[PDB]
């Protein structure tokens, strides 16, 4: 199986530095054309940098002189050194093995880079409690409000991954405070309220915040 | 006492692929370079280390005439300090190059209606060429850990790419014939000179 | 840099429909144009390379056409798993450049939302703040209107909405509207309601609670 | 671009000399190889010699080393071929041909005709070639006109004022040892018509303003 | 010096056929400096190929040159009627030392046609001027190779006859030939029998046509 697994993204103060890594399996990074592409949240794709099979490097003008693409054969890993970082460099960064011949193109799943002077802050997790008096068509809703965190991302699971059907974890919105907030909800049969326990597992790695919140009726 | 045989480089029926670029050495002869720098036939005529309108005033120990076909958008790589598919993997000029790069459109000669697949360039290479290096390998390119054993496949790619020149392509995708003149002024006597 | 002008920016089509996207380049790029598919949450995946060539594995309902400046990308019979944002990309002139993207909505029968309102938790209120959440669950089309009514007054300026991307399984959307108040302001009002207008509802649906009642 | 323009035709008497010019336009003159090529009537192309105007050292084919001098003038981009002690055998078209050091193509001039003859302009005698009463080749008879002792070329020969074109052969002229040309025109006809059909050959020689209509009758 | 020998000397083909002409050099010659010419009667040579394989302007692509070293080839992929002509090869260079091949004639192939032979005595009007020209006509033959010998009282003449040959006829592909025997009136009136003997591939036995001076 060919894999591109990225790491290194996080929150960095403006003007600071960050190194992204792209650990590859299934092909030899130092022998191949490889690139970085970024996507600001809610926006389109922007090419950042390419390294050719033989080492020549090219850069988007918005990052020339600040970013450096490189690779290490012993670790079969592609890198992106990002210096003098700017607010507008905030985005998800993808590595890719570029299309050259058919059957080659593949992208990693991305790492989030946030450039901000703001502090890292973990979330408060509040229950959205169900009620047998608030059911609609034999269906009850419950959830978790994950409030006032920075930066992205958080992950939310229900009952440790056993409850997936009916879950809606909403995209985060930036509040007026500069903090993010989201809800994760699930609809369930109303007959399951007295008998089934519902626990939301919230993880916010930038703050090592791990919360399991039991959500019970009223 | 000899005219330099520049016609068999510039006026040849067929030119080389750039990965397999030709080189002719020119020595102990004279040439009127006026016929060259007073020609309108040339879309590129850039000289480095020498002035074009002065070549008839200089003697050189040795002149090399390299020649090949690339597409128009790639002629800019035939210069010192350049990178790219042609400069990195096909034909590389040194940073201290002294000489002239001459190029002209050859759509009428090197394009064919179905596509001319005889002109090729190297697309895959693990390292860049040294100046004036020629790499004619057609070994399957190993893009992973598993060896290729002469078989194309995943991570196993033919290293050359055909231009497929077609007369209807745009100018930057049309064939251009290139001649690189390398003037060497060493400690040997002056043999290749200019006259009127 | 080469500008890629992609249109439309969004479209909505029924299962089985033919969907055509266009891309126009600012200059001649021969056929060095690739088409990417980006599904919600995922990295882009190459579908079509060099304008017309189907990448290995990619179903045959995807196709492409063009040389020079004008290009098209077609889906022969749209399927609900084709919910994605589609991007063109020219790759032979540096910098590599992408079109703006085409967002694809799949059509289904009108689906009215289930509506639920959640009062703030006692735990949040001890902190000095009160979030009220209104949930619209599993509806189509995406167009919906949510109004907060506080003691029958229309409340603006202190609510934010978030919508899910269209579900690949039932082709529905869900939406949350969160109303945030200081604990002191929250205690100035009694009845908190969200009123929901949607094409699947013959009349607006209102869900409410009285602050301090259970 | 490049163009080679040679001097005009010459008529020269045995023992005289001739100097043919070749003016080049285009700026490739000095750095070129400029050669002279001869073609005698009925014969092939023969390289005589050449010169590079930058070096001025002419080189000659062995067959021409004695009587040919090839010169070139850079100040007027004109090359020259001078041949001394002319004889009738030197009657030919002389061509200048050029190769630039910068190309493999050859540039040729238009040719210069040199005719070696003691002759002045002279119109032809026209004599009948009478059809035989016994030398019938299978029911066909031959008749003609001998067009003899004229100078210079050309003559035109028609039969019956152009009404008779079928079966006519007008042979190329030869330069006789007298310095004058001669040719025959013949026509084959049915033998059965020899006593009924009139055959007249019309010879026109414009250089001498000479027109001759010779009636050809059986012997 | 270099010698370029062309082969064959005469190529006899029909329109639509492929023509292959050869040029062989006594030494190895650079392929950059080999040319081919076409010449038609009464015309200057026309450059077709230069640099062994480059076509000059206006030359159709049914003409292709190839070769290297000592063997060079001109191929005409399908003869058109305009292609029947004489073709020369040329070795040249950037030195003044060039040589031409001797020529290959590309002619229309045809069935063998024996000549019709005619002999013409000198006219009484020419004899008034002291000369006697005797004319022997070979009419409409193929191939071009023919022998014409003059016998005067069974004595083989030499040095007193000239031949002319027509170009190959556009409509029947034949040649015609005139041999002219020139004697002084004094010599002509010394002898009795004037004969031209003709040898040709279409004649079973050599055909002799004669007259006795003074007979009707
Ligand atoms: C091998 O080289 C020959 C010879 O090239 C000519 O001689 C050299 C010694 C040197 O001086 C060259 O610069 C010179 O061109 C090539 O044969 C010539 O090829 C050119 C290009 O095809 C022809 O010139 C063109 O003719 C066109 C039609 O007549 C005309 O449209 C062109 O004009 C264009 O450009 C001019 C400005 O330069 C402008 O005025 C026009 O309006 C238009 O834009 C141009 O004149 C010559 O006629 C050719 N000469 C002969 C004898 O054939 C040959 O192509 C080359 N072969 C190879 C394989 O390289
Ligand atoms: Cl691996
Ligand atoms: Cl080659
Ligand atoms: Cl150099
Ligand atoms: Cl190899
Ligand atoms: Cl391959
Ligand atoms: Cl640009
Ligand atoms: Cl559409
Ligand atoms: Cl003169
Ligand atoms: Cl000869
Ligand atoms: Cl008369
Ligand atoms: Cl010509
Ligand atoms: Cl050609
Ligand atoms: Cl040479
Ligand atoms: Cl010769
Ligand atoms: K992966
Ligand atoms: K972006
Ligand atoms: K991340
Ligand atoms: K939310
Ligand atoms: K080639
Ligand atoms: K490498
Ligand atoms: K897919
Ligand atoms: K095109
Ligand atoms: K709204
Ligand atoms: K939904
Ligand atoms: K309450
Ligand atoms: K001949
Ligand atoms: K004829
Ligand atoms: K004839």
Author numbering:
A (entry chain H): 1 to 218
B (entry chain E): 333 to 528
C (entry chain L): 1 to 214
D (entry chain A): 1 to 219
E (entry chain B): 1 to 216
Passage from the reporting paper:
Alpha-B.1.1.7, Beta-B.1.351, Gamma-P.1, and Delta-B.1.617.2 variants of SARS-CoV-2 express multiple mutations in the spike protein (S). The RBD mutations found in Alpha (N501Y), Beta (K417N, E484K, and N501Y), Gamma (K417T, E484K, and N501Y), and Delta (L452R and T478K) are located in or closely adjacent to the ACE2-interacting surface where they have the potential to modulate ACE2 interaction or disrupt the binding of neutralizing mAbs. To understand this, we generated 674 mAbs from Beta-infected individuals and performed a detailed structure-function analysis of the 27 most potent mAbs: one binding the spike N-terminal domain (NTD), the rest the receptor-binding domain (RBD). A detailed structure-function analysis comprising 22 X-ray and cryo-EM structures is presented for 16 Fabs most in complexes with RBD or S, which allows an understanding of the changes in antigenicity of the Beta S protein.
The relatively high resolution (2.8 Å) of the Beta-49 Fab/S structure suggested that the complex is rather rigid. Both mAbs attach in the same configuration, despite the presence of 19 amino acid differences in the variable domain of the heavy chain (VH) alone. The N-linked glycan attached to residue 343 of the RBD also forms part of the epitope, the sugar becoming displaced from its usual position, twisting the sidechain of N343 into an unfavorable conformation. Despite the sequence variation between the two mAbs the RBD interactions are very similar and involve conserved residues. A large portion of the HC interacting area is formed by the H3 loop (375 out of 632 Å2 for Beta-49). The Fab-bound S trimer shows all three RBDs in a down configuration, with the HC making interactions with two RBDs, causing the RBD to be translated/rotated toward the periphery of the trimer. This “down and out” orientation has not, to the best of our knowledge, been seen before. The residues comprising the primary (but not the secondary) epitope are conserved between SARS-CoV-1 and -2, and we were able to show that both mAbs bind SARS-CoV-1 and -2 S to a similar degree.
